[PDB]
Design an enzyme around this catalytic site. Structure first.
Site, PDB file in Angstrom:
ATOM      1  NE  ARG A   1     -19.169  15.136  18.131  1.00  0.00           N
ATOM      2  CZ  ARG A   1     -17.988  15.620  18.505  1.00  0.00           C
ATOM      3  NH1 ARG A   1     -16.948  14.813  18.706  1.00  0.00           N
ATOM      4  NH2 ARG A   1     -17.844  16.925  18.661  1.00  0.00           N
TER       5      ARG A   1
ATOM      6  NE  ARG B   1     -18.213  15.840  23.062  1.00  0.00           N
ATOM      7  CZ  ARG B   1     -18.613  14.589  22.838  1.00  0.00           C
ATOM      8  NH1 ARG B   1     -19.882  14.230  23.008  1.00  0.00           N
ATOM      9  NH2 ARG B   1     -17.731  13.689  22.437  1.00  0.00           N
TER      10      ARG B   1
ATOM     11  CD  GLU C   1       1.642  -1.972   3.081  1.00  0.00           C
ATOM     12  OE1 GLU C   1       2.184  -1.026   2.488  1.00  0.00           O
ATOM     13  OE2 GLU C   1       0.595  -2.495   2.664  1.00  0.00           O
TER      14      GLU C   1
ATOM     15  CG  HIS D   1      -2.170  -0.864   0.979  1.00  0.00           C
ATOM     16  ND1 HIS D   1      -2.128  -2.214   1.254  1.00  0.00           N
ATOM     17  CD2 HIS D   1      -3.427  -0.606   0.545  1.00  0.00           C
ATOM     18  CE1 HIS D   1      -3.307  -2.750   0.995  1.00  0.00           C
ATOM     19  NE2 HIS D   1      -4.115  -1.794   0.568  1.00  0.00           N
TER      20      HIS D   1
END
Lengths: 220, 250, 220, 250, 250, 220
Positions: free
Chosen positions: E165, E220, E77, E5
């Site tokens: 949420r 938050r 990888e 990848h």
């Protein structure tokens, strides 16, 4: 008197905010002997407690008994009496070929193979040690020239009854750390864990006792 | 020295095949006292053992300690030593309003809120008591005139959050046990303790017989507090029951 | 009329507080025939119910169908109509070498390998039989000279599709007891379970029917 | 006598490879009646079987009984007998306010609140209907002019607590199912029943085709109660749908 | 072309044995810029790689993408490519009221609310950071004068319902995560993110070292909103920390 | 601007109520190229979005990235912007001997071996595709003469690291469909899934792209 099991009052602690919590009464006395002004406080069931002083500050040493369930009682009742930092010392076998008898293991986190840790947090929550306590244990081990390994410990409810943990890099097996680390990390208490290697299938305990005391000193 | 923790040899047991197993080593002597020729065998950690005689047969009395891990050690080593019948004696609080201090509880099976039992059987397996043991306990209670309740006990790996206690350092219980006490109450659970899921599961799965009796010394759901001497008198009755139960199982 | 499935009213029960609950209609009639004043009440789907009298008291016999799900309907709807004690009788195979064809099994508790028991209590709760019912079954079995074994039964959702249960001392396999025992023990109802051994791989049903009736008598 | 419960031989089926499977044996005759040359094969317990003809091909109609265990027996034995396509017909209540009595439900997949399906595939595997069967059911419904809803069904091992019913002996539901009905409603689940998780999981995992249609005869979320004759008329329409679906799958 | 990848060869890494792993490929260049002789290696999907030098030793900087699946690919990888130490840098919101925008978080271990970690160790295994990495991060933060918090992070397979949420399309969270945020808050969890359970579990179970630092850019639980430039300044500090941490681990 | 990750406003969508959601940016451009008035809207992280028009109606094409977690962000944020139907196209291997390279797979439901689907519904809920979307995919595949198989897909969090799925009739393996189908079926959104067979261990992608577009057309 203030607690259900330990037979202690807040006043008995004389301002103590740290406890050393080994499993066995014989080890408690040995640990307290290393400190100043050692005094036996109480002995009920599995819980034998002594008081002592480090750099002019009160510290308690209290045995836990065997397993997460008894350990859970000791830690809770000591927290009710004002302790906010807990250091466990034990003796174990290792499961890694490069770990020598006489080496010292500082546990960063435990595999949660016990039942009691689940009474504090769901399985996905890490049985992780406090950073300050972990650092102090590593420092104190270097201080006396100990050979130290730092990593993960497997913690279970049975002493006796697969090489997956070895392949995953697990250092050692014991029965108490999962409950201790999880219950403290999920409740705003600091905890550390250190052990001396007494046996290794792929192959000198006073050291761990000195190390735990000297670690305590750095945390006051 | 035949076993790894109890510090006992096979011969020390004198062919004893039944054991009475309290949690607290302080209670070992006083239950051994109800029997003939009581002798202190060994005392290591919370494993205190005494041997005695009942109708001419050797009996062992050995403490388990607190929790399933400790108990499993005691049971395993005594089983190795030839014990085949285990009678647990305890003192307990109740969780039902209609169970009074001074009542006696005989446990038919336990809710497995522990870890150590899972090492002996999967969760699907019941933590069930032996029929003969349960019968003997129920009959000894009734012969004594005790007010007896027979049913399910909840067995927990913790004294605090697994028993849904909020008067703790943190004041919190993990969602698994939030509302759990009301649930067990509605299901007819009699009481909480900490050792039976391990005892009953390991014995039922290994061809060994086990039962459990306990005296009620307190009730969280009642406003009245227990009397000082009534707690000591309930303890002596429970002890009497377990010995008289043992007589029928020899 | 009072219930969704059974087609019964409270009045149909004439004060009955005990039911015998086998799986099959042919067995219901056989059981009722042993008692006084047997009367067929209803037959809807799997649920065929008869009424009868023991020592001047009304008792009901009602078939459950196959498995925990149908069993759960029968027991709930009978409880709504005033039954507080339930006794199941079946016929099974044994899995233990010392259990003979013709022997009688009284179940103290079941392995919960079904799905329906979980609709009543979480897995950790025991599928345990009531002590009075268990005692009455053992007494009635001794009364007619039956060879009796008392212990654990494995209860599952499939008839056909490891020797762990044998190694653990499990007596037999069936499909209904887990749901029955769990649903009753967790809801303040008494339940008992008895079976006649019809086959054993490691190796005369009217008896179990007589035993269940005589047990019922002791529980009124 | 080729199978262990149904009391049927292979030859009795006359090469039939599709079966219509109601729950109630009372319904077997009346759906067989919609087809050519209906004959009563056998009747043992709640497994009543009839054979008929549709466009010249043999069809079986067999009852399953209540619950997954019973259903698994029926399906397994009929599969042994050579049935390769299973169409379930039922009557059901709805759990959505906008689904009206007299509407028809075709199930794409089921929520697996049962035990028997786990014997055929792990919980991760979907209790999914065959595409061809689902298409035939949807097309037969529309050809008839039925108001049709296509989606998920919740399949429960119990009629009472798994369906979150409180008007029971105990008045209580275990925490797993407390609040569960509101959850399924919010997720778009159409209805509750008791047999489909087993039917659909065993067929999808074994190279067999299955679908399910049901007529809505009641709605717990609506205040109005169903008419007497409208319940019998919804049942006849559902039956019509399943036969006309079967015609397209032969 | 040595890996499937990343589009990288072993030789491209020039013997590099430590990698800094941000999530966003936009951040790869700017952290490589803090080091000597930065060169763009490859860029495929969200895997952008740059190589640089620190005290004369080759270092890699490679993006992971969002989520555990993507991260597992990157880590696997790069490990194949010879990377043995992984330092994660991020920006995060906090979940504790006393953690302020501009603070720095060093993660000791993570709550495993993800799926990919389970492929590397069972749930019982802790998603724990390496001690040396954690120490280096803590020391670099302090040398810089950053306000630092050291503790547990919750690592989620979703940005919305796993982080509880409600301001979403559906407005609903599945029961597993209903009330979950208050639970983690009470347990001392510092923040939510989406990649660490995978990173830390796969490295701890495979003899590789990993740590994680993040700058707090929002909270938050606080009413005040973050300043525009303070968010960009927190990002530059975090980047500084991770490079200075890397210097001590070479 | 309206959403946290995608960098899009409601207005950007010009009334669009359907999105095609492949994993990769190169595939997005290819799909949009098949439609009328293709316009690139945004590119942030894994999420590259284009707008286009089918039969005079707006459609969006937006890449998801790798795995359930990134897919979950894309779908949620597109739903906040007004999309109610989602069609995924991918390329995969097959695990069934009768499935040929060049064949097209329409997924009815997925095996839930991912972690993200559990954030939307418990394991017992089916990862099932919408009937309209499934029908439109099958129709559009027949429309261009594709060889089509319709069934179950296995969906996991890892690309690499038992023949139980084959024995159970599972067509193929991928990483995104479980999250996609579960999150849509449990939240009142329609979803479909189609793939082209690029490899089979027991043994031409533009087709699946054409099929997904033509399916979209039937759903507007």
């Amino acid at each position: 008197s203030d607690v259900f099991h330990l037979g202690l009052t807040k006043n008995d602690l004389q301002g103590a905010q740290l406890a050393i919590v080994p499993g066995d009464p014989e080890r408690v006395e040995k640990i307290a002997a290393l400190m100043d002004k050692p005094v036996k406080l109480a002995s009920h069931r599995e819980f034998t407690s002594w008081r002592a002083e480090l750099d002019g500050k009160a510290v308690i040493v209290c045995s836990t008994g065997i397993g997460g369930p008894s350990t859970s009682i000791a830690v809770e009742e000591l927290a009710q009496l004002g302790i906010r930092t807990f250091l466990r010392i034990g003796t174990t076998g290792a499961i890694q070929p490069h770990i020598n008898v006489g080496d010292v293991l500082v546990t960063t986190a435990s595999v949660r193979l016990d039942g009691a840790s689940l009474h504090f947090a769901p399985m996905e929550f890490p049985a992780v040690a406090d950073f300050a306590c972990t650092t102090a244990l590593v420092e104190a081990a270097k201080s006396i020239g100990a050979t130290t390994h730092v990593g993960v410990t497997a913690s279970s409810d049975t002493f006796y009854p697969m090489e997956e943990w070895q392949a995953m890099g697990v250092m050692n097996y014991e029965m108490e750390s999962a409950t201790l680390l999880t219950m403290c990390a999920s409740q705003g208490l600091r905890a550390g864990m250190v052990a001396g290697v007494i046996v290794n299938r792929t192959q000198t305990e006073s050291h761990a006792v000195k190390i735990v005391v000297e670690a305590a000193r750095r945390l006051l």
